[PDB]
Amino acid sequence: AAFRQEANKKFKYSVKLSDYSTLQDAVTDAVDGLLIDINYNFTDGESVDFXGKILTINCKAKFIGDGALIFNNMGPGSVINQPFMESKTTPWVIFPWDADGKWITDAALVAATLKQSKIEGYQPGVNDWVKFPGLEALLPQNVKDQHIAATLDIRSASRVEIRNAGGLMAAYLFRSCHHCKVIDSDSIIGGKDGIITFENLSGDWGLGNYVIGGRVHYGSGSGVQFLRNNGGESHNGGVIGVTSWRAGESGFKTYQGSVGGGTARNYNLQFRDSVALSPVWDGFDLGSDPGMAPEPDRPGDLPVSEYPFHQLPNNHLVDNILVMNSLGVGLGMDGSGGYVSNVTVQDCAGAGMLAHTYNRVFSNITVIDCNYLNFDSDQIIIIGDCIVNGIRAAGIKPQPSNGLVISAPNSTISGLVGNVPPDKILVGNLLDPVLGQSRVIGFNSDTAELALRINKLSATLDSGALRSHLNGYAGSGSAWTELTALSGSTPNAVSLKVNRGDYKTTEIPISGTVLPDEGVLDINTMSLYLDAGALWALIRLPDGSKTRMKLSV
Amino acid sequence: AAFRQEANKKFKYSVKLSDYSTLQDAVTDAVDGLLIDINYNFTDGESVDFXGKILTINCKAKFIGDGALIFNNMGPGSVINQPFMESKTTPWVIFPWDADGKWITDAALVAATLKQSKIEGYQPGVNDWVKFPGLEALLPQNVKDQHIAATLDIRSASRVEIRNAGGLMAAYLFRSCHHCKVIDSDSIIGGKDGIITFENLSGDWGLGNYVIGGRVHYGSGSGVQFLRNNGGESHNGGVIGVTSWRAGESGFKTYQGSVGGGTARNYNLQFRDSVALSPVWDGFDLGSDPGMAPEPDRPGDLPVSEYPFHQLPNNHLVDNILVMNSLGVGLGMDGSGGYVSNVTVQDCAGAGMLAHTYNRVFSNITVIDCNYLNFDSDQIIIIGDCIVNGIRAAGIKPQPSNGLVISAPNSTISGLVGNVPPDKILVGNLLDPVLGQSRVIGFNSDTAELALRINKLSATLDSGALRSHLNGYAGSGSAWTELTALSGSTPNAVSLKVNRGDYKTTEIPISGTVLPDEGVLDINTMSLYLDAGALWALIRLPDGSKTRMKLSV
Amino acid sequence: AAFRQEANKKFKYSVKLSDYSTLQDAVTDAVDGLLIDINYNFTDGESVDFXGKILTINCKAKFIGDGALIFNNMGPGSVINQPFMESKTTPWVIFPWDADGKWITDAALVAATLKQSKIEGYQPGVNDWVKFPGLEALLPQNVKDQHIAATLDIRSASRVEIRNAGGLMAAYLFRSCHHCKVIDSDSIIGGKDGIITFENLSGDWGLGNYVIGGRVHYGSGSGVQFLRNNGGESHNGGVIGVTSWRAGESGFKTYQGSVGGGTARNYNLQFRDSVALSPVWDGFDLGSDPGMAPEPDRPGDLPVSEYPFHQLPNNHLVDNILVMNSLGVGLGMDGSGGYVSNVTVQDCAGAGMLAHTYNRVFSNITVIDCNYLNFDSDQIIIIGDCIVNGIRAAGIKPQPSNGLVISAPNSTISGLVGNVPPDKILVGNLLDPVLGQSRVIGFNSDTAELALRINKLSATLDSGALRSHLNGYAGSGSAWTELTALSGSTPNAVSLKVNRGDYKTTEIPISGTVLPDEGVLDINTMSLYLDAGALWALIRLPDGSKTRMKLSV
Ligand code: NA
């Protein structure tokens, strides 16, 4: 027993699941470490009490079951390394992508993808009935009633970290937790529920809860979702460095509206350095208020008298995010106030951005090659009084026949770049007030121009131009400049020209008919016209009266 | 004893603090692991000798004390997991933020926030006497003399990592260390000293020392700070992926000047993918030379004869950083040479950038809604001969009445975007020399224009314009173009017009008075004027002489 | 034996290398953990069988040897913490950087840097014979025949992670692996081979293999390289958050062409949030097809009949990358389709980008101060039919005398920013079609202008301008506007002026010689000329005929 005391003092404590016959039995005996060394088949609702102990759980095997494996009373600072949640049942799933990776949108074609799989696709539900109209009638009731996921449900914990999580038809759910993190997820294949969820509907608002690094795949819901989290003025919560691919709902979601009669909304979260690829709905769905507005107020939240619907000061910190190939909307948001920067949305089947926002600033935005499936939608939509500073809005695909590129009727936009069709923009104001010494260069052309267009007058026709044209041939050393104006809906119809033909003269438009008095406006100005084959001047004199003078003989 | 040898060969070695009565006693007995399983109350200056052993220290409890807990002779490659430093004393702190999150700047109001807390606010000191003038007289001497922090002081170590650090009124200090890292800090609440500090004032310059990921909060000093670190040409050192919130000084700081009679300056460090929120002074303070210049040379550093003050080749790698709501300056720097890219400063109470820099390039910069408290300061300041390529400089807030938007009198700027007031810019040159085929579009307007302004002539009045105006009504198919010039300080006073009224003529300004000979300049040009009610031409002929011809009868 | 069973149930299992006399012997006895507690000197080809066991290998010492240490049959989920590979031999290396950090390019000067070192520089080889012409003849055969590296060779494993790897003349090689990661590398000093390599030439294409975080230094080859990896539509593989410094080849490389008679190419990998500094060849070399084209087809890959050479749909996800000081090309790529965003290449000795690409989009690009050694190369090269949206293309260094800034003859470019020489651009089209209400401001100047240039006519001379000039002096309240045209290769030769001298008149160019009929073009226009000392008008009348009218008496 000299050795018993020596050993107890010098060796690390860990128990291993294979030495017990229930997960609870192993946890009861644990002091420091717990090794999951054999697969463990759990029952729905199986509950494990950690007695407030701060354990390091090292997983080297799987938790298999349908339903929830519930972890209660974990001590703060506990760590779960490499957990793997796998459903027992192999569910029926749809797979709305073809062999070449293209979206399948036709209900009958989507229905024909139906197969049993634990490794790809997702279990269809109410959202799919809207996304693929007609699908609901093509599937049997037992498929529609499925709800398969192996869920790790961590309850009322603080400062618990899950590292390098995996799974098949899996969910990780934190209920009433704070300062909890899910780090470096290992391409978790989702099941029926959101893949990673922080749910704080009761108790204190959620705070300090994050998903950092790693990736999630598929799932019938959203990759990462929050309910009643507030990161506070410190913005202590959210998503940094995460990728979602082929989410059945959205990559990343802040819940909208109410759940269980009280608010599920979120405030002051980060969404940074993250990527959503091919979500069925949105890349990032960051709104607070639901579109269908089924209640007139916000139980448990700020009242509508203080902030109208879609005007909450949600104040998320959104920077350096990327979305590609969304079927819904790339970036969806609502609210008042705040900043959005460094966003890249490219090659989305539906709209690129739909911001139902007021008094928000958007800087350094790229939304290109969106609406490539030609939905009846605009590519970039801003509803309220916002500012856009620097936006690239044209890619390489031919423009869809439906919709505008930009619809931002109450916004001011500067720094719009790309081969954007000038007739497919609706904005409050488009402004570039601080160019320096400037130059327009025409390439592969006989001309260089600065055209002018007045949208109110005509969306499709330039109203006038300043244009330079080469005289003769490349290398001639001579060009001509013109100032033009639209007439009879014909661009450049009326044109004043300097140095055409290298004659070093000015060709001046004159009226071929006798001008009325209104043909001259300002004092000390002259307009020219023809009358009975003679050249005449109509002049407004220094005293403001008008006179006519014959100039030819 | 068969078992003694079997056990010694098959079990992991770890000792636990609860089996001993001093931290030193536990460390002396450690071989591989050390578990901190019970809180440990240390005395200031308590020193622990690790005997060169490479330990993994797993903390599941706190180190509590006022002053420094000193770790000597750690072996290379040691790891400290989840340490938590907590002060013994609960200090008096100020809290210059109100209930709505707004800055409190009035000294009496800041003084009234004084309370005892270990969890938020900071202990005031000499910097606060300048930041909140009058505060110094409102606080008692014992508050002013406080210096509470629980400091983990790691001395002369190599390749030691601290992971998932926490604390309350805490500091982590590395003295004369190299290749040391502080990773994924868990919202460490700072105390009187900088939160994380690498101090290499003696010995070899610091190299390879980083803060990677995670967050720090409050502190009376800077979140992360370096003294006499040089990352070398490899840029092996700095900050990647870190957030600081409500630093009492600056988020991230390279020390300026001398400490203890020798340089504390830094070179070739990274500042990337990092965020400073609501610092009292600067978001990132990256200068090398101090503003007050209390010595004429640089002991231990490059001489002033080689590089004048504010001209050191500090060469930090600064990319993808974000600052919001700073009370001081968002981004502060000095030095010569180098590159800064992808910076976003938004919604700062004081200036957004103050670069006392020479021969530096700034690309893809956003500095918007800065100086919102209307200090007597410009928003964006560059002192020396720099280049700015792409800068967004206007947000949604009304402009402050004081200061310029940009003051960069020796710099060249291209790609300036936003609704920037054209009279609130002072630059060396503003240049956009490579526009392509271009078009100006007016929205919600009867006109579209390209105005011209000559700053020397007038900062506030356009000197002339090319303008298009609709004829009549939306859909008329007709517009008119004018070329205008300023006269008598009235914009567009003198105007040549093409197609006004859809008459297809040119209205030409003429002099209402007899022109002097100087009224025509170039050979083979003509100016028109009125004399005794007749139209005359003043013409410079091919031989260079001038003549007057009567055109009317 | 009560205690034997008690101990076996409560303590963590780990074996340590010092209790054995071969690494295999220790591994055979391992169950859970393995501690490398003493240096281990291995022989080339030493092979260790892990028997499918899922081990955590904690290294606190080095693996020293020349050649490969081979790890077979590792169980999935194994982890190797802090390995350190060090060569036995100290090789002869070159060091083509001088004391001030500048490149050494002269063969004799590079040859003179030859020294024996394990800690910096690299072993020269066939690429250096091309990079430094003449070097091959200056080195002895035994230096040329060297091939020193200590290689950790992990074979046919899944979900194995290496964390915090280090080394001296080291390589980490994964052969036929999947879902393997190399995380937070600790400035591994490379040897003769690529530093980190995923080689999947046989078996299934590589999938899920990454390098995340950390840094690599030197090496004679590329920092990170892939062979026959396909991240699939999910883009599950690549490089995130990594830095390479002074790679003897390229920072990051997708292999081109064939190895061993079958393809070594790669598809659908990420290259994000990563930095290449001072590579001898490229920062990122992301092409698929080799330049020298030594075979007419692609064994094991897509046929040339489907995709011509340089047109593969490689579809890498490239975003937020930074390159500086490359001697070769900063960013090299080829292929068809796809997107590249948020790239920063600055201060490169050779070209900044060489994209042999077709139907690709580039958005938010900075390529500045490239070709600073004045190679016979353009700075930015795009070969095929691409789109560039937003590009900063001028820094602070004087332009090199050789080459163009941009050579993209089949591309369309918008949003080109910087003081780019207008004569050093060759593009398909340069287009800025959606400016808003605009203004040009001249600083430190008597004038403000919008110049026009027609590249076909002249690359170097403006063809015309709209210019504003101050009248008299600062504060006069008066300016004049002119519309000018090029003649006799003299810019602004022919000029129509409004309000010069504040006379409120128009100075109109007229022909000093009798105009031919071709001197007037449009109906109801007039050109003026002198004939025998009189002013005449040449007018095209409403019926289309031309007439001449004498206007003076
Ligand atoms: Na006459």
mmCIF file of C-alpha atoms in Angstrom, chain B residues 252-348:
data_model
loop_
_atom_site.group_PDB
_atom_site.id
_atom_site.type_symbol
_atom_site.label_atom_id
_atom_site.label_comp_id
_atom_site.label_asym_id
_atom_site.label_seq_id
_atom_site.Cartn_x
_atom_site.Cartn_y
_atom_site.Cartn_z
ATOM 1 C CA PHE B 252 -3.255 46.424 -29.690
ATOM 2 C CA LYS B 253 -0.011 48.323 -29.094
ATOM 3 C CA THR B 254 3.568 48.391 -30.227
ATOM 4 C CA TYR B 255 5.418 50.316 -27.515
ATOM 5 C CA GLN B 256 6.937 53.620 -28.446
ATOM 6 C CA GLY B 257 10.242 55.050 -27.309
ATOM 7 C CA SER B 258 12.366 53.772 -24.406
ATOM 8 C CA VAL B 259 11.724 51.853 -21.168
ATOM 9 C CA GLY B 260 14.485 51.618 -18.564
ATOM 10 C CA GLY B 261 16.883 53.614 -20.756
ATOM 11 C CA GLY B 262 16.806 51.347 -23.874
ATOM 12 C CA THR B 263 14.423 50.934 -26.757
ATOM 13 C CA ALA B 264 10.976 49.306 -26.366
ATOM 14 C CA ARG B 265 10.219 49.577 -30.085
ATOM 15 C CA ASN B 266 9.094 46.756 -32.431
ATOM 16 C CA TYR B 267 9.619 45.742 -36.068
ATOM 17 C CA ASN B 268 8.164 43.263 -38.592
ATOM 18 C CA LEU B 269 5.128 42.072 -36.613
ATOM 19 C CA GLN B 270 1.750 40.920 -37.984
ATOM 20 C CA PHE B 271 -1.560 42.588 -37.190
ATOM 21 C CA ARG B 272 -4.096 40.543 -39.171
ATOM 22 C CA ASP B 273 -7.695 39.336 -39.030
ATOM 23 C CA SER B 274 -8.202 41.215 -35.729
ATOM 24 C CA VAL B 275 -10.862 43.503 -34.235
ATOM 25 C CA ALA B 276 -10.749 46.388 -31.707
ATOM 26 C CA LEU B 277 -14.103 47.532 -30.252
ATOM 27 C CA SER B 278 -14.647 50.635 -28.026
ATOM 28 C CA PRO B 279 -11.040 51.315 -26.853
ATOM 29 C CA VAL B 280 -10.572 54.459 -24.764
ATOM 30 C CA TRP B 281 -7.516 55.387 -26.831
ATOM 31 C CA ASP B 282 -6.685 53.615 -30.161
ATOM 32 C CA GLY B 283 -7.929 50.430 -31.846
ATOM 33 C CA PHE B 284 -4.424 49.598 -33.135
ATOM 34 C CA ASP B 285 -1.522 51.863 -31.928
ATOM 35 C CA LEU B 286 1.339 50.814 -34.191
ATOM 36 C CA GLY B 287 3.756 53.702 -34.026
ATOM 37 C CA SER B 288 7.381 53.464 -32.959
ATOM 38 C CA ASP B 289 8.325 56.986 -31.880
ATOM 39 C CA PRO B 290 6.542 58.901 -29.091
ATOM 40 C CA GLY B 291 4.706 62.124 -29.769
ATOM 41 C CA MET B 292 6.247 64.113 -26.886
ATOM 42 C CA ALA B 293 9.822 63.285 -27.984
ATOM 43 C CA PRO B 294 11.539 63.508 -24.614
ATOM 44 C CA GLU B 295 14.982 62.335 -25.879
ATOM 45 C CA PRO B 296 16.954 63.352 -28.977
ATOM 46 C CA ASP B 297 18.141 59.883 -29.998
ATOM 47 C CA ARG B 298 17.198 56.178 -29.700
ATOM 48 C CA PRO B 299 19.360 54.289 -27.248
ATOM 49 C CA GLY B 300 19.579 50.628 -28.370
ATOM 50 C CA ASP B 301 17.831 51.313 -31.720
ATOM 51 C CA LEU B 302 18.468 52.905 -35.148
ATOM 52 C CA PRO B 303 19.923 56.412 -34.869
ATOM 53 C CA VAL B 304 18.034 59.640 -35.746
ATOM 54 C CA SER B 305 20.820 60.424 -38.246
ATOM 55 C CA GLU B 306 19.693 57.385 -40.247
ATOM 56 C CA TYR B 307 15.902 57.732 -39.698
ATOM 57 C CA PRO B 308 14.285 60.899 -38.306
ATOM 58 C CA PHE B 309 11.609 60.579 -35.648
ATOM 59 C CA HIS B 310 8.437 59.013 -37.083
ATOM 60 C CA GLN B 311 10.422 57.590 -40.065
ATOM 61 C CA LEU B 312 11.550 54.138 -38.787
ATOM 62 C CA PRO B 313 11.177 51.194 -41.221
ATOM 63 C CA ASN B 314 8.901 49.376 -38.808
ATOM 64 C CA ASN B 315 7.414 47.326 -41.607
ATOM 65 C CA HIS B 316 4.499 45.718 -39.836
ATOM 66 C CA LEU B 317 2.257 43.441 -41.897
ATOM 67 C CA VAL B 318 -1.186 45.048 -41.408
ATOM 68 C CA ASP B 319 -4.110 43.421 -43.260
ATOM 69 C CA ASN B 320 -7.766 42.694 -42.642
ATOM 70 C CA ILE B 321 -8.310 44.618 -39.417
ATOM 71 C CA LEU B 322 -11.514 46.208 -38.070
ATOM 72 C CA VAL B 323 -12.013 49.001 -35.530
ATOM 73 C CA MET B 324 -15.289 50.433 -34.200
ATOM 74 C CA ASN B 325 -16.263 53.035 -31.597
ATOM 75 C CA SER B 326 -12.764 54.154 -30.488
ATOM 76 C CA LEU B 327 -12.668 57.285 -28.338
ATOM 77 C CA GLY B 328 -9.081 58.165 -29.414
ATOM 78 C CA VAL B 329 -7.934 57.235 -32.939
ATOM 79 C CA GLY B 330 -9.077 54.058 -34.717
ATOM 80 C CA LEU B 331 -5.735 53.238 -36.419
ATOM 81 C CA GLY B 332 -2.564 55.044 -35.318
ATOM 82 C CA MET B 333 0.776 54.532 -36.976
ATOM 83 C CA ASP B 334 4.096 56.108 -37.910
ATOM 84 C CA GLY B 335 7.176 55.192 -39.921
ATOM 85 C CA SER B 336 8.571 54.991 -43.436
ATOM 86 C CA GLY B 337 8.078 52.420 -46.145
ATOM 87 C CA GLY B 338 5.665 49.567 -46.124
ATOM 88 C CA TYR B 339 2.095 48.534 -46.995
ATOM 89 C CA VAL B 340 -1.280 48.640 -45.221
ATOM 90 C CA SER B 341 -4.281 46.844 -46.785
ATOM 91 C CA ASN B 342 -7.859 45.940 -46.182
ATOM 92 C CA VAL B 343 -8.590 48.123 -43.170
ATOM 93 C CA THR B 344 -12.135 48.892 -41.952
ATOM 94 C CA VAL B 345 -12.640 51.681 -39.382
ATOM 95 C CA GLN B 346 -16.293 52.564 -38.795
ATOM 96 C CA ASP B 347 -18.324 54.629 -36.283
ATOM 97 C CA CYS B 348 -15.437 55.994 -34.178
#
